[PDB]
Amino acid sequence: PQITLWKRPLVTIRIGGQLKEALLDTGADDTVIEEMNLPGKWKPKMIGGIGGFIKVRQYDQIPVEIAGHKAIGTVLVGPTPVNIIGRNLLTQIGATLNF
């Protein structure tokens, strides 16, 4: 689909068999999801954003369905203000910026 930016590019995603809302974020290198229970092992990690660094749980090869499109990759779980889908997963679904 073609998405305009007059409103936040929020879409429904399915992760861990659970539906959630997430922001298509071209300005994010990684995908960061709000604290939740994901199966499998995780390694501690730190990522930075506008107001500093935060500690997150890194889960690898996690299946994520974005607007019906399949992706399998790294998902960081931590105290983020909103769920964001970053470039690591956006590239998997062939997302591009056009103008």
Add this chain to the structure above:
Amino acid sequence: PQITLWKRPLVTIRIGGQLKEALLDTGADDTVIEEMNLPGKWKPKMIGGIGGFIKVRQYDQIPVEIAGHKAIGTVLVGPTPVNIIGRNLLTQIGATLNF
């Protein structure tokens, strides 16, 4: 044009008569520019993200050229690690997400 997301979507912009490299960010509601002595009246503001909040100066009606595309709107100047072009200006240049 069409921009892929293999790398950070960095483009050249022109603000206050200066050329800068900025990030096209669909996840940013506002445009945040690195510290610079821009002329004009401003109002104190606090914006948050991953990381917490940072203090910025809000400047309205600032002419910004993005890849040859003229635009004008609110620009927040503060201690940001990178120049961020948010949705407030992306909509003006007709930018869209496609997948």
